[PDB]
């Protein structure tokens, strides 16, 4: 499957793509404002994620640090990124269909559109100014808007027991971005696409 990753932000981002225990494609790359990077994701990938990282520094070996979304200090991510991270999430070729969503469960750093480039389903978007409107207690000093689990480490926010409800903090993310997951047991905003669809992830779509 092809994913075209487009940075429409005025600032540089370092895109990342992983399924948690491996890179997808090269796993990460710098995208200056306006740049596009097309990756190939193996059919059947379950639990893949694409995200932006901000304010990164990498040495010549590809080792360094990012203020949001850092994946063990690597340019080329093999693992998931440090919150806060707006997440484009997908599982491909799952009994004939693909499943996509955007999630704010690990917070928000950069606005995103995640859309098919092929027929048969709709995209999803979370492009509100979540960072600017972020509740004071969720603001990440390093940049971005943390989720409440990350900040407070409670069963209720992290849904540890598999029982949790919406919270004042989840409702903030849901108000600004109704079409993204705001907490683990949110009413799903997953889109079912034809199996083997292709996609585009656009940072700062508006």
XYZ file of N, CA and C in Angstrom:
618
model
N 0.899 -1.221 0.000
C 0.000 0.000 0.000
C 0.888 1.207 0.000
N 0.459 2.243 -0.701
C 1.226 3.465 -0.696
C 0.576 4.498 0.206
N 1.431 5.169 0.956
C 1.002 6.338 1.776
C 1.863 7.532 1.372
N 1.227 8.563 0.854
C 1.915 9.791 0.538
C 1.768 10.664 1.762
N 2.895 11.068 2.331
C 2.935 11.906 3.519
C 3.372 13.288 3.105
N 2.496 14.266 3.341
C 2.643 15.623 2.820
C 2.746 16.591 4.011
N 3.772 17.436 4.088
C 3.847 18.430 5.114
C 3.373 19.768 4.556
N 2.154 20.159 4.873
C 1.629 21.480 4.486
C 1.865 22.530 5.589
N 2.468 22.122 6.693
C 2.832 23.071 7.745
C 3.881 24.056 7.267
N 3.871 25.244 7.891
C 4.931 26.217 7.610
C 6.284 25.871 8.230
N 6.318 24.890 9.108
C 7.495 24.455 9.816
C 7.877 23.047 9.353
N 9.144 22.691 9.467
C 9.620 21.343 9.230
C 9.051 20.358 10.238
N 8.647 19.198 9.733
C 8.333 18.040 10.567
C 9.201 16.858 10.149
N 9.395 15.920 11.067
C 10.047 14.672 10.783
C 9.006 13.612 10.889
N 8.551 13.138 9.743
C 7.524 12.135 9.715
C 8.055 10.831 10.268
N 7.173 10.012 10.820
C 7.510 8.721 11.385
C 6.431 7.700 11.029
N 6.841 6.447 10.849
C 5.892 5.381 10.487
C 6.407 4.095 11.095
N 5.608 3.456 11.936
C 5.991 2.271 12.656
C 4.758 1.422 12.901
N 4.972 0.133 13.176
C 3.920 -0.728 13.731
C 4.266 -1.174 15.142
N 5.198 -0.465 15.768
C 5.442 -0.640 17.190
C 6.644 -1.499 17.522
N 6.869 -2.541 16.733
C 7.994 -3.442 16.853
C 8.835 -3.459 15.573
N 8.566 -2.522 14.648
C 9.294 -2.390 13.429
C 8.950 -1.073 12.761
N 9.899 -0.574 11.979
C 9.642 0.525 11.054
C 8.673 0.079 9.981
N 7.910 1.032 9.473
C 7.248 0.905 8.162
C 8.096 1.663 7.134
N 8.510 0.995 6.055
C 9.387 1.658 5.083
C 10.663 2.053 5.851
N 11.227 3.219 5.567
C 12.416 3.677 6.255
C 12.160 4.098 7.702
N 10.892 4.243 8.097
C 10.530 4.544 9.474
C 10.467 6.035 9.818
N 11.232 6.874 9.119
C 11.177 8.301 9.374
C 11.966 9.072 8.343
N 11.633 10.353 8.171
C 12.326 11.222 7.246
C 11.957 12.669 7.540
N 12.874 13.594 7.270
C 12.568 15.015 7.377
C 11.650 15.446 6.203
N 10.635 16.262 6.496
C 9.802 16.884 5.504
C 9.805 18.387 5.763
N 10.533 19.125 4.928
C 10.421 20.564 4.977
C 9.006 21.004 4.537
N 8.657 22.280 4.802
C 7.349 22.820 4.429
C 7.124 22.599 2.953
N 6.030 21.900 2.645
C 5.655 21.563 1.279
C 6.085 20.239 0.718
N 7.044 19.579 1.377
C 7.593 18.326 0.872
C 6.618 17.155 1.064
N 6.770 16.182 0.178
C 5.988 14.961 0.121
C 6.959 13.792 0.117
N 6.619 12.768 0.893
C 7.341 11.540 1.011
C 6.384 10.378 0.852
N 6.613 9.541 -0.150
C 5.765 8.380 -0.376
C 6.472 7.136 0.172
N 5.742 6.441 1.032
C 6.185 5.184 1.592
C 5.340 4.018 1.142
N 5.974 2.854 1.223
C 5.300 1.597 0.980
C 5.116 0.831 2.273
N 3.868 0.450 2.541
C 3.498 -0.282 3.748
C 3.023 -1.660 3.277
N 3.580 -2.702 3.888
C 3.250 -4.085 3.495
C 1.767 -4.381 3.710
N 1.129 -5.007 2.735
C -0.233 -5.468 2.968
C -0.307 -6.329 4.220
N -1.447 -6.272 4.875
C -1.643 -6.983 6.131
C -1.059 -6.324 7.367
N -0.434 -5.157 7.228
C 0.078 -4.454 8.397
C -1.040 -4.167 9.392
N -0.872 -4.641 10.624
C -1.877 -4.469 11.675
C -1.320 -3.492 12.704
N -2.068 -2.461 13.037
C -1.592 -1.615 14.108
C -0.466 -0.679 13.686
N -0.492 -0.216 12.450
C 0.459 0.773 11.991
C 0.016 2.173 12.379
N 1.008 3.058 12.512
C 0.785 4.459 12.848
C 1.751 5.341 12.111
N 1.269 6.501 11.701
C 2.099 7.562 11.130
C 1.871 8.820 11.991
N 2.935 9.549 12.244
C 2.844 10.757 13.037
C 3.936 11.733 12.610
N 3.775 12.967 13.036
C 4.794 14.025 12.938
C 5.577 14.172 14.197
N 6.827 14.503 14.016
C 7.685 14.919 15.092
C 8.163 16.344 14.851
N 8.239 17.106 15.918
C 8.651 18.497 15.858
C 9.947 18.808 16.622
N 10.655 19.817 16.125
C 11.863 20.372 16.777
C 12.866 19.278 17.074
N 13.298 18.628 16.001
C 14.249 17.532 16.057
C 15.644 17.986 15.702
N 16.591 17.275 16.314
C 17.985 17.363 15.960
C 18.502 15.939 15.784
N 19.183 15.663 14.679
C 19.846 14.375 14.460
C 21.257 14.585 13.979
N 22.152 13.763 14.515
C 23.535 13.731 14.038
C 23.646 12.978 12.705
N 24.886 12.847 12.217
C 25.134 12.156 10.957
C 24.769 10.669 10.953
N 24.747 10.043 12.129
C 24.300 8.650 12.280
C 22.783 8.482 12.345
N 22.024 9.573 12.407
C 20.565 9.482 12.550
C 20.093 9.331 13.980
N 20.895 9.799 14.919
C 20.571 9.735 16.358
C 20.443 11.129 16.910
N 19.446 11.344 17.768
C 19.239 12.648 18.331
C 18.037 12.716 19.220
N 17.227 13.758 19.023
C 16.093 14.018 19.895
C 15.048 14.842 19.170
N 13.787 14.610 19.517
C 12.663 15.470 19.069
C 11.857 15.915 20.275
N 11.307 17.117 20.202
C 10.438 17.602 21.305
C 9.077 16.977 21.405
N 8.516 16.540 20.274
C 7.327 15.730 20.277
C 7.539 14.488 19.434
N 7.003 13.337 19.824
C 6.987 12.177 18.985
C 8.283 11.417 18.845
N 9.266 11.728 19.714
C 10.591 11.086 19.659
C 10.408 9.563 19.774
N 11.082 8.815 18.905
C 11.056 7.338 18.924
C 12.419 6.785 19.313
N 12.739 6.839 20.575
C 14.052 6.346 21.022
C 15.243 7.061 20.420
N 15.062 8.347 20.092
C 16.141 9.178 19.512
C 16.586 8.874 18.085
N 15.780 8.103 17.359
C 16.169 7.692 16.007
C 15.454 8.583 14.969
N 16.166 8.939 13.919
C 15.524 9.536 12.722
C 14.582 8.501 12.114
N 15.073 7.283 11.969
C 14.325 6.220 11.332
C 13.648 5.385 12.392
N 12.404 5.714 12.708
C 11.702 5.081 13.828
C 11.444 3.621 13.626
N 11.717 2.836 14.678
C 11.333 1.436 14.737
C 10.239 1.199 15.756
N 9.994 2.163 16.609
C 9.015 2.062 17.665
C 8.098 3.288 17.652
N 7.045 3.256 18.469
C 6.124 4.386 18.576
C 6.776 5.577 19.279
N 6.172 6.709 19.061
C 6.710 7.980 19.504
C 6.184 8.465 20.845
N 6.978 9.314 21.449
C 6.686 9.839 22.764
C 5.542 10.846 22.658
N 4.504 10.753 23.475
C 3.431 11.776 23.433
C 3.986 13.169 23.740
N 3.342 14.227 23.267
C 2.079 14.220 22.562
C 2.248 13.995 21.056
N 1.404 13.151 20.488
C 1.455 12.808 19.066
C 0.070 12.634 18.535
N -0.338 13.449 17.564
C -1.562 13.154 16.810
C -1.265 11.906 15.996
N -2.163 10.936 15.996
C -1.849 9.654 15.352
C -2.784 9.336 14.161
N -2.202 9.008 13.015
C -2.928 8.340 11.930
C -2.707 6.837 12.109
N -3.781 6.106 12.307
C -3.683 4.697 12.698
C -4.389 3.860 11.665
N -3.847 2.665 11.383
C -4.404 1.832 10.334
C -4.066 0.376 10.516
N -4.999 -0.473 10.057
C -4.783 -1.893 9.912
C -5.308 -2.278 8.547
N -4.461 -2.931 7.768
C -4.684 -3.140 6.334
C -4.979 -4.616 6.096
N -5.867 -4.877 5.145
C -6.180 -6.243 4.678
C -6.588 -7.168 5.831
N -7.540 -6.681 6.608
C -8.074 -7.400 7.751
C -9.410 -7.991 7.275
N -9.376 -9.252 6.875
C -10.544 -9.917 6.308
C -11.179 -9.144 5.169
N -10.342 -8.646 4.262
C -10.825 -8.032 3.034
C -10.986 -6.528 3.035
N -10.759 -5.904 4.191
C -10.958 -4.472 4.337
C -9.788 -3.837 5.047
N -9.700 -2.541 4.869
C -8.732 -1.712 5.601
C -9.519 -0.861 6.620
N -8.869 -0.496 7.732
C -9.480 0.292 8.811
C -8.548 1.408 9.192
N -9.058 2.637 9.141
C -8.272 3.829 9.443
C -8.951 4.725 10.462
N -8.150 5.462 11.219
C -8.669 6.434 12.150
C -7.597 7.477 12.456
N -8.040 8.566 13.060
C -7.137 9.474 13.763
C -7.427 9.384 15.263
N -6.363 9.439 16.050
C -6.483 9.343 17.514
C -5.735 10.448 18.183
N -6.390 10.996 19.223
C -5.832 11.923 20.194
C -5.615 11.252 21.550
N -5.647 9.928 21.611
C -5.467 9.224 22.917
C -4.067 9.414 23.494
N -3.083 9.673 22.606
C -1.699 9.944 23.011
C -1.406 11.437 22.792
N -2.430 12.275 22.872
C -2.289 13.699 22.739
C -2.254 14.188 21.330
N -1.921 15.454 21.190
C -1.971 16.152 19.884
C -0.749 17.024 19.776
N -0.076 16.986 18.632
C 1.035 17.884 18.364
C 0.858 18.708 17.101
N 0.422 18.061 16.030
C 0.319 18.672 14.713
C -1.014 18.267 14.108
N -1.720 19.200 13.473
C -2.998 18.880 12.819
C -2.790 17.978 11.610
N -3.786 17.132 11.366
C -3.638 16.073 10.367
C -4.939 15.782 9.631
N -4.813 15.494 8.346
C -5.857 14.846 7.523
C -5.332 13.475 7.092
N -6.155 12.443 7.200
C -5.790 11.096 6.762
C -6.896 10.603 5.845
N -6.606 10.573 4.545
C -7.614 10.288 3.518
C -7.160 9.206 2.530
N -8.105 8.371 2.050
C -7.782 7.507 0.922
C -7.520 8.342 -0.334
N -6.641 7.824 -1.185
C -6.416 8.360 -2.528
C -7.051 7.470 -3.567
N -7.683 6.396 -3.119
C -8.409 5.496 -3.978
C -9.879 5.494 -3.544
N -10.736 4.848 -4.330
C -12.186 4.892 -4.128
C -12.730 4.113 -2.969
N -13.897 4.551 -2.493
C -14.746 3.705 -1.706
C -14.908 3.963 -0.228
N -14.346 5.073 0.229
C -14.497 5.491 1.649
C -14.078 6.983 1.781
N -14.293 7.507 2.958
C -14.066 8.887 3.248
C -12.767 9.001 4.084
N -12.223 10.205 4.142
C -11.143 10.513 5.060
C -11.622 10.997 6.406
N -10.665 11.186 7.287
C -10.870 11.771 8.608
C -9.854 12.886 8.844
N -10.196 13.840 9.690
C -9.359 15.007 9.903
C -9.461 15.472 11.327
N -8.336 15.916 11.885
C -8.293 16.616 13.160
C -7.367 17.801 12.940
N -7.970 18.936 12.629
C -7.211 20.129 12.218
C -7.489 21.373 13.035
N -8.247 21.250 14.103
C -8.504 22.342 15.045
C -7.217 22.734 15.780
N -7.199 23.926 16.367
C -6.024 24.442 17.049
C -5.956 23.899 18.485
N -5.780 22.593 18.579
C -5.787 21.931 19.886
C -4.639 22.447 20.739
N -3.464 22.720 20.155
C -2.351 23.220 20.954
C -2.693 24.584 21.543
N -3.246 25.471 20.722
C -3.537 26.799 21.232
C -4.633 26.810 22.280
N -5.604 25.905 22.168
C -6.717 25.881 23.105
C -6.549 24.907 24.278
N -5.425 24.203 24.335
C -5.125 23.121 25.278
C -5.371 23.572 26.706
N -6.113 22.758 27.490
C -6.211 23.042 28.919
C -4.826 23.215 29.555
N -4.698 24.173 30.444
C -3.436 24.471 31.071
C -2.735 23.222 31.636
N -3.507 22.355 32.274
C -2.914 21.184 32.946
C -2.397 20.133 31.949
N -2.848 20.211 30.711
C -2.411 19.279 29.654
C -1.281 19.823 28.773
N -0.986 21.105 28.835
C 0.019 21.688 27.984
C 1.365 21.041 28.195
N 2.026 20.628 27.110
C 3.352 20.003 27.255
C 4.383 21.100 27.169
N 5.253 21.269 28.226
C 6.237 22.333 28.140
C 7.129 22.189 26.922
N 7.400 20.949 26.521
C 8.192 20.706 25.338
C 7.468 20.986 24.030
N 6.163 21.225 24.099
C 5.394 21.520 22.901
C 4.229 20.527 22.776
N 3.067 20.979 22.273
C 1.906 20.113 22.149
C 0.935 20.040 23.328
N -0.063 19.176 23.221
C -1.164 19.049 24.193
C -1.192 17.568 24.588
N -0.783 17.254 25.817
C -0.760 15.873 26.288
C -2.179 15.375 26.522
N -2.319 14.063 26.355
C -3.539 13.394 26.851
C -3.450 13.276 28.382
N -4.618 13.090 29.003
C -4.700 12.997 30.450
C -4.053 11.754 31.046
N -3.991 10.634 30.312
C -3.318 9.444 30.823
C -1.828 9.759 31.045
N -1.208 10.316 30.000
C 0.183 10.727 30.068
C 0.430 11.637 31.257
N -0.443 12.608 31.504
C -0.188 13.545 32.585
C -0.423 12.947 34.000
N -1.555 12.257 34.176
C -2.048 11.882 35.497
C -1.956 10.430 35.874
N -1.799 9.539 34.891
C -1.537 8.118 35.200
C -2.560 7.479 36.101
N -3.827 7.686 35.761
C -4.921 7.065 36.511
C -5.587 5.960 35.693
N -6.211 5.039 36.399
C -6.992 3.974 35.737
C -8.065 4.581 34.866
N -8.683 5.662 35.332
C -9.787 6.241 34.574
C -9.326 6.865 33.279
N -8.210 7.571 33.259
C -7.770 8.185 32.047
C -7.090 7.182 31.103
N -6.417 6.184 31.658
C -5.655 5.233 30.858
C -6.508 4.026 30.470
N -7.696 3.887 31.041
C -8.648 2.792 30.784
C -8.051 1.460 31.110
N -7.301 1.435 32.203
C -6.529 0.289 32.599
C -7.390 -0.919 32.825
N -8.553 -0.717 33.437
C -9.469 -1.831 33.864
C -10.381 -2.246 32.710
N -10.336 -1.487 31.610
C -11.213 -1.701 30.458
C -12.575 -1.093 30.728
N -12.682 -0.380 31.840
C -13.851 0.344 32.205
C -13.341 1.750 32.433
N -13.902 2.658 31.686
C -13.652 4.058 31.875
C -14.739 4.751 31.093
N -15.020 5.993 31.493
C -15.919 6.861 30.737
C -15.190 8.063 30.186
N -15.912 8.910 29.466
C -15.382 10.195 29.061
C -15.093 11.040 30.262
N -14.229 12.014 30.071
C -13.726 12.866 31.166
C -13.719 14.306 30.703
N -13.520 15.255 31.590
C -13.405 16.634 31.150
C -12.310 16.822 30.123
N -11.208 16.106 30.312
C -10.108 16.203 29.367
C -10.405 15.520 28.042
N -10.990 14.321 28.045
C -11.332 13.674 26.756
C -12.318 14.547 25.978
N -13.298 15.121 26.689
C -14.304 15.949 26.032
C -13.715 17.174 25.367
N -12.610 17.705 25.890
C -11.873 18.794 25.204
C -11.390 18.372 23.831
N -10.690 17.241 23.785
C -10.233 16.763 22.483
C -11.398 16.436 21.546
N -12.464 15.880 22.089
C -13.643 15.496 21.268
C -14.393 16.707 20.753
N -14.495 17.761 21.546
C -15.114 19.007 21.091
C -14.355 19.623 19.951
N -13.044 19.686 20.070
C -12.221 20.319 19.015
C -12.165 19.390 17.816
N -12.144 18.064 18.021
C -11.990 17.112 16.923
C -12.932 15.913 17.092
N -14.189 16.096 16.676
C -15.156 15.036 16.867
C -14.820 13.746 16.121
N -14.029 13.845 15.068
C -13.808 12.681 14.175
C -12.523 11.966 14.533
N -11.964 12.219 15.713
C -10.782 11.519 16.252
C -11.125 10.863 17.567
N -10.453 9.757 17.884
C -10.644 9.112 19.179
C -10.123 10.034 20.256
N -10.933 10.247 21.300
C -10.513 11.066 22.440
C -10.131 10.330 23.693
N -10.543 9.064 23.817
C -10.207 8.223 24.939
C -10.382 6.773 24.448
N -9.893 5.823 25.240
C -9.777 4.432 24.755
C -11.152 3.885 24.344
N -12.197 4.169 25.108
C -13.548 3.605 24.842
C -14.506 4.569 24.176
N -13.941 5.567 23.481
C -14.756 6.486 22.716
C -15.571 5.716 21.673
N -16.728 6.254 21.354
C -17.528 5.694 20.259
C -16.610 5.733 19.029
N -16.394 4.601 18.369
C -15.376 4.598 17.310
C -15.644 5.533 16.133
N -14.558 6.114 15.645
C -14.575 6.990 14.474
C -13.716 6.351 13.390
N -13.594 5.044 13.466
C -12.858 4.253 12.450
C -13.650 4.199 11.150
N -12.959 4.349 10.044
C -13.509 4.262 8.698
C -13.076 2.956 8.078
N -14.018 2.236 7.470
C -13.754 1.031 6.764
C -13.550 1.374 5.311
N -12.386 1.012 4.783
C -12.051 1.243 3.389
C -11.872 -0.096 2.670
N -11.971 -0.068 1.333
C -11.686 -1.315 0.654
C -10.293 -1.855 1.019
N -10.162 -3.176 1.044
C -8.850 -3.786 1.236
C -7.887 -3.283 0.174
N -6.652 -3.042 0.590
C -5.611 -2.575 -0.340
C -5.851 -1.179 -0.912
N -6.514 -0.317 -0.145
C -6.590 1.093 -0.546
C -5.193 1.763 -0.389
N -5.038 2.938 -0.981
C -3.856 3.792 -0.772
C -4.320 5.086 -0.138
N -3.361 5.789 0.452
C -3.693 6.908 1.341
C -2.765 8.085 1.209
N -3.214 9.215 1.788
C -2.407 10.387 1.967
C -2.620 10.887 3.383
N -1.538 11.186 4.076
C -1.523 11.835 5.399
C -0.981 13.226 5.147
N -1.786 14.248 5.414
C -1.373 15.621 5.236
C -1.273 16.310 6.591
N -0.097 16.820 6.935
C 0.062 17.609 8.133
C -0.297 19.053 7.835
N -0.999 19.689 8.777
C -1.518 21.047 8.582
C -2.357 21.205 7.300
N -3.425 20.413 7.193
C -4.218 20.406 5.979
C -4.923 21.723 5.687
N -5.217 22.517 6.695
C -5.911 23.797 6.521
C -5.013 24.944 6.999
